[PDB]
PDB file of C-alpha atoms in Angstrom:
ATOM      1  CA  UNK D   1     107.106 111.988  88.076  1.00  0.00           C
ATOM      2  CA  UNK D   2     105.098 114.507  86.019  1.00  0.00           C
ATOM      3  CA  UNK D   3     106.034 117.686  87.923  1.00  0.00           C
ATOM      4  CA  UNK D   4     102.745 119.625  88.157  1.00  0.00           C
ATOM      5  CA  UNK D   5     103.193 123.406  87.658  1.00  0.00           C
ATOM      6  CA  UNK D   6     101.177 126.219  86.045  1.00  0.00           C
ATOM      7  CA  UNK D   7     100.571 124.789  82.538  1.00  0.00           C
ATOM      8  CA  UNK D   8      99.037 121.816  84.363  1.00  0.00           C
ATOM      9  CA  UNK D   9      95.759 123.551  85.271  1.00  0.00           C
ATOM     10  CA  UNK D  10      96.054 126.129  82.478  1.00  0.00           C
ATOM     11  CA  UNK D  11      96.092 123.399  79.789  1.00  0.00           C
ATOM     12  CA  UNK D  12      94.244 120.743  81.800  1.00  0.00           C
ATOM     13  CA  UNK D  13      91.535 123.172  82.995  1.00  0.00           C
ATOM     14  CA  UNK D  14      91.721 126.339  80.864  1.00  0.00           C
ATOM     15  CA  UNK D  15      92.842 125.948  77.237  1.00  0.00           C
ATOM     16  CA  UNK D  16      90.721 129.072  76.585  1.00  0.00           C
ATOM     17  CA  UNK D  17      92.085 131.377  79.310  1.00  0.00           C
ATOM     18  CA  UNK D  18      95.577 130.303  78.251  1.00  0.00           C
ATOM     19  CA  UNK D  19      94.829 132.138  75.014  1.00  0.00           C
ATOM     20  CA  UNK D  20      93.433 135.265  76.708  1.00  0.00           C
ATOM     21  CA  UNK D  21      96.311 135.038  79.216  1.00  0.00           C
ATOM     22  CA  UNK D  22      98.802 135.479  76.355  1.00  0.00           C
ATOM     23  CA  UNK D  23      96.782 138.548  75.308  1.00  0.00           C
ATOM     24  CA  UNK D  24      97.246 140.008  78.819  1.00  0.00           C
ATOM     25  CA  UNK D  25     100.955 139.582  78.370  1.00  0.00           C
ATOM     26  CA  UNK D  26     100.541 141.373  75.020  1.00  0.00           C
ATOM     27  CA  UNK D  27      99.184 144.302  77.063  1.00  0.00           C
ATOM     28  CA  UNK D  28     102.192 144.614  79.451  1.00  0.00           C
ATOM     29  CA  UNK D  29     104.443 144.699  76.369  1.00  0.00           C
ATOM     30  CA  UNK D  30     102.005 147.126  74.674  1.00  0.00           C
ATOM     31  CA  UNK D  31     102.993 149.337  77.590  1.00  0.00           C
ATOM     32  CA  UNK D  32     106.714 149.312  76.944  1.00  0.00           C
ATOM     33  CA  UNK D  33     105.618 149.783  73.327  1.00  0.00           C
ATOM     34  CA  UNK D  34     102.722 152.233  73.876  1.00  0.00           C
ATOM     35  CA  UNK D  35     105.579 154.492  75.026  1.00  0.00           C
ATOM     36  CA  UNK D  36     106.885 154.787  71.450  1.00  0.00           C
ATOM     37  CA  UNK D  37     103.146 154.527  70.722  1.00  0.00           C
ATOM     38  CA  UNK D  38     102.868 151.218  68.852  1.00  0.00           C
ATOM     39  CA  UNK D  39     100.976 147.911  69.264  1.00  0.00           C
ATOM     40  CA  UNK D  40     102.159 144.283  69.692  1.00  0.00           C
ATOM     41  CA  UNK D  41     100.000 141.231  68.792  1.00  0.00           C
ATOM     42  CA  UNK D  42     102.210 138.086  69.079  1.00  0.00           C
ATOM     43  CA  UNK D  43     103.803 137.781  72.532  1.00  0.00           C
ATOM     44  CA  UNK D  44     104.894 134.252  71.586  1.00  0.00           C
ATOM     45  CA  UNK D  45     106.918 135.251  68.490  1.00  0.00           C
ATOM     46  CA  UNK D  46     107.921 138.525  70.146  1.00  0.00           C
ATOM     47  CA  UNK D  47     110.709 136.557  71.820  1.00  0.00           C
ATOM     48  CA  UNK D  48     111.324 134.765  68.547  1.00  0.00           C
ATOM     49  CA  UNK D  49     113.547 137.746  67.960  1.00  0.00           C
ATOM     50  CA  UNK D  50     114.438 139.176  71.396  1.00  0.00           C
ATOM     51  CA  UNK D  51     114.058 142.506  69.548  1.00  0.00           C
ATOM     52  CA  UNK D  52     110.919 143.704  71.324  1.00  0.00           C
ATOM     53  CA  UNK D  53     112.814 142.594  74.447  1.00  0.00           C
ATOM     54  CA  UNK D  54     115.734 145.060  74.444  1.00  0.00           C
ATOM     55  CA  UNK D  55     113.059 147.599  73.465  1.00  0.00           C
ATOM     56  CA  UNK D  56     111.291 146.986  76.803  1.00  0.00           C
ATOM     57  CA  UNK D  57     114.505 147.844  78.637  1.00  0.00           C
ATOM     58  CA  UNK D  58     114.617 151.246  76.842  1.00  0.00           C
ATOM     59  CA  UNK D  59     110.960 152.311  76.549  1.00  0.00           C
ATOM     60  CA  UNK D  60     110.948 151.591  80.271  1.00  0.00           C
ATOM     61  CA  UNK D  61     113.908 153.842  81.125  1.00  0.00           C
ATOM     62  CA  UNK D  62     112.768 156.195  78.324  1.00  0.00           C
ATOM     63  CA  UNK D  63     115.531 156.315  75.691  1.00  0.00           C
ATOM     64  CA  UNK D  64     116.108 155.798  71.941  1.00  0.00           C
ATOM     65  CA  UNK D  65     116.657 152.040  71.395  1.00  0.00           C
ATOM     66  CA  UNK D  66     116.783 151.311  67.617  1.00  0.00           C
ATOM     67  CA  UNK D  67     115.633 147.798  66.625  1.00  0.00           C
ATOM     68  CA  UNK D  68     119.192 147.180  65.300  1.00  0.00           C
ATOM     69  CA  UNK D  69     121.277 148.574  68.196  1.00  0.00           C
ATOM     70  CA  UNK D  70     121.423 145.487  70.400  1.00  0.00           C
ATOM     71  CA  UNK D  71     122.647 142.141  68.949  1.00  0.00           C
ATOM     72  CA  UNK D  72     122.563 141.704  65.155  1.00  0.00           C
ATOM     73  CA  UNK D  73     119.213 140.892  63.503  1.00  0.00           C
ATOM     74  CA  UNK D  74     117.964 137.292  64.104  1.00  0.00           C
ATOM     75  CA  UNK D  75     118.342 135.458  60.752  1.00  0.00           C
ATOM     76  CA  UNK D  76     117.896 131.797  61.761  1.00  0.00           C
ATOM     77  CA  UNK D  77     116.815 129.908  64.885  1.00  0.00           C
ATOM     78  CA  UNK D  78     120.139 129.851  66.672  1.00  0.00           C
ATOM     79  CA  UNK D  79     120.318 133.603  66.104  1.00  0.00           C
ATOM     80  CA  UNK D  80     116.903 133.953  67.749  1.00  0.00           C
ATOM     81  CA  UNK D  81     117.692 131.618  70.668  1.00  0.00           C
ATOM     82  CA  UNK D  82     120.635 133.973  71.147  1.00  0.00           C
ATOM     83  CA  UNK D  83     118.774 137.271  71.169  1.00  0.00           C
ATOM     84  CA  UNK D  84     116.669 135.631  73.948  1.00  0.00           C
ATOM     85  CA  UNK D  85     119.604 134.108  75.841  1.00  0.00           C
ATOM     86  CA  UNK D  86     120.918 137.665  75.792  1.00  0.00           C
ATOM     87  CA  UNK D  87     117.781 139.295  77.167  1.00  0.00           C
ATOM     88  CA  UNK D  88     118.047 136.534  79.746  1.00  0.00           C
ATOM     89  CA  UNK D  89     121.624 137.705  80.355  1.00  0.00           C
ATOM     90  CA  UNK D  90     120.921 141.389  81.107  1.00  0.00           C
ATOM     91  CA  UNK D  91     117.885 140.120  83.014  1.00  0.00           C
ATOM     92  CA  UNK D  92     119.713 137.571  85.164  1.00  0.00           C
ATOM     93  CA  UNK D  93     121.706 140.663  86.120  1.00  0.00           C
ATOM     94  CA  UNK D  94     118.784 143.084  86.247  1.00  0.00           C
ATOM     95  CA  UNK D  95     117.095 140.277  88.274  1.00  0.00           C
ATOM     96  CA  UNK D  96     114.629 137.705  86.811  1.00  0.00           C
ATOM     97  CA  UNK D  97     116.988 135.093  88.308  1.00  0.00           C
ATOM     98  CA  UNK D  98     117.014 131.776  86.395  1.00  0.00           C
ATOM     99  CA  UNK D  99     113.969 131.534  84.043  1.00  0.00           C
ATOM    100  CA  UNK D 100     112.037 128.245  84.262  1.00  0.00           C
ATOM    101  CA  UNK D 101     111.948 127.257  80.529  1.00  0.00           C
ATOM    102  CA  UNK D 102     114.943 127.826  78.147  1.00  0.00           C
ATOM    103  CA  UNK D 103     115.736 130.672  75.648  1.00  0.00           C
ATOM    104  CA  UNK D 104     114.655 128.130  73.020  1.00  0.00           C
ATOM    105  CA  UNK D 105     111.363 127.181  74.664  1.00  0.00           C
ATOM    106  CA  UNK D 106     110.625 130.922  74.310  1.00  0.00           C
ATOM    107  CA  UNK D 107     111.724 131.593  70.696  1.00  0.00           C
ATOM    108  CA  UNK D 108     109.937 128.267  70.076  1.00  0.00           C
ATOM    109  CA  UNK D 109     106.814 130.429  69.569  1.00  0.00           C
ATOM    110  CA  UNK D 110     105.340 127.973  72.081  1.00  0.00           C
ATOM    111  CA  UNK D 111     103.025 129.417  74.706  1.00  0.00           C
ATOM    112  CA  UNK D 112     103.419 127.006  77.639  1.00  0.00           C
ATOM    113  CA  UNK D 113     106.986 127.861  78.647  1.00  0.00           C
ATOM    114  CA  UNK D 114     107.042 131.427  77.298  1.00  0.00           C
ATOM    115  CA  UNK D 115     104.026 132.021  79.555  1.00  0.00           C
ATOM    116  CA  UNK D 116     105.773 130.899  82.738  1.00  0.00           C
ATOM    117  CA  UNK D 117     108.450 133.576  82.115  1.00  0.00           C
ATOM    118  CA  UNK D 118     106.078 136.302  80.914  1.00  0.00           C
ATOM    119  CA  UNK D 119     104.257 135.744  84.208  1.00  0.00           C
ATOM    120  CA  UNK D 120     107.533 136.342  86.005  1.00  0.00           C
ATOM    121  CA  UNK D 121     107.665 139.774  84.292  1.00  0.00           C
ATOM    122  CA  UNK D 122     104.003 140.812  84.716  1.00  0.00           C
ATOM    123  CA  UNK D 123     104.829 140.218  88.312  1.00  0.00           C
ATOM    124  CA  UNK D 124     107.782 142.603  88.501  1.00  0.00           C
ATOM    125  CA  UNK D 125     106.261 145.308  86.219  1.00  0.00           C
ATOM    126  CA  UNK D 126     102.654 145.052  87.402  1.00  0.00           C
ATOM    127  CA  UNK D 127     103.595 147.536  90.167  1.00  0.00           C
ATOM    128  CA  UNK D 128     106.557 149.136  88.405  1.00  0.00           C
ATOM    129  CA  UNK D 129     105.789 151.234  85.349  1.00  0.00           C
TER     130      UNK D 129
ATOM    131  CA  UNK B   1      98.116 129.251  89.791  1.00  0.00           C
ATOM    132  CA  UNK B   2      94.858 129.249  87.792  1.00  0.00           C
ATOM    133  CA  UNK B   3      92.509 130.624  90.468  1.00  0.00           C
ATOM    134  CA  UNK B   4      95.095 133.388  91.055  1.00  0.00           C
ATOM    135  CA  UNK B   5      95.643 134.295  87.379  1.00  0.00           C
ATOM    136  CA  UNK B   6      91.907 135.126  87.145  1.00  0.00           C
ATOM    137  CA  UNK B   7      91.572 136.502  90.695  1.00  0.00           C
ATOM    138  CA  UNK B   8      93.934 139.229  89.396  1.00  0.00           C
ATOM    139  CA  UNK B   9      92.706 139.487  85.778  1.00  0.00           C
ATOM    140  CA  UNK B  10      89.195 140.315  87.068  1.00  0.00           C
TER     141      UNK B  10
END
């Protein structure tokens, strides 16, 4: 039973918009970043570190969040899957509920899954600064 | 949610 979801049409009817769609997710993050006045370019690998993630939490509330203040620095994969399972932890609390894909599917630099979750955010921040 | 993704990205 191939469960049909979002990637279905996105990949089966818009392999091009899927690319531009990631770039729109780069914009929402460019917002949490534009605060410290910066610029992101790889939403996919931005979770391959969960670093830019804890930064969102701070640049949103407006505070000093050093890149090495949250969990240690991701060195290998497991360490990255962690930094994302963690963002997923303060998120499951701060809301977000249960993400669809898995902390790996995100760090996996893959777009498909990572996009289903990024959508979830664009949804909650689209109206909230 | 294709039609929607673009109906909002307009």
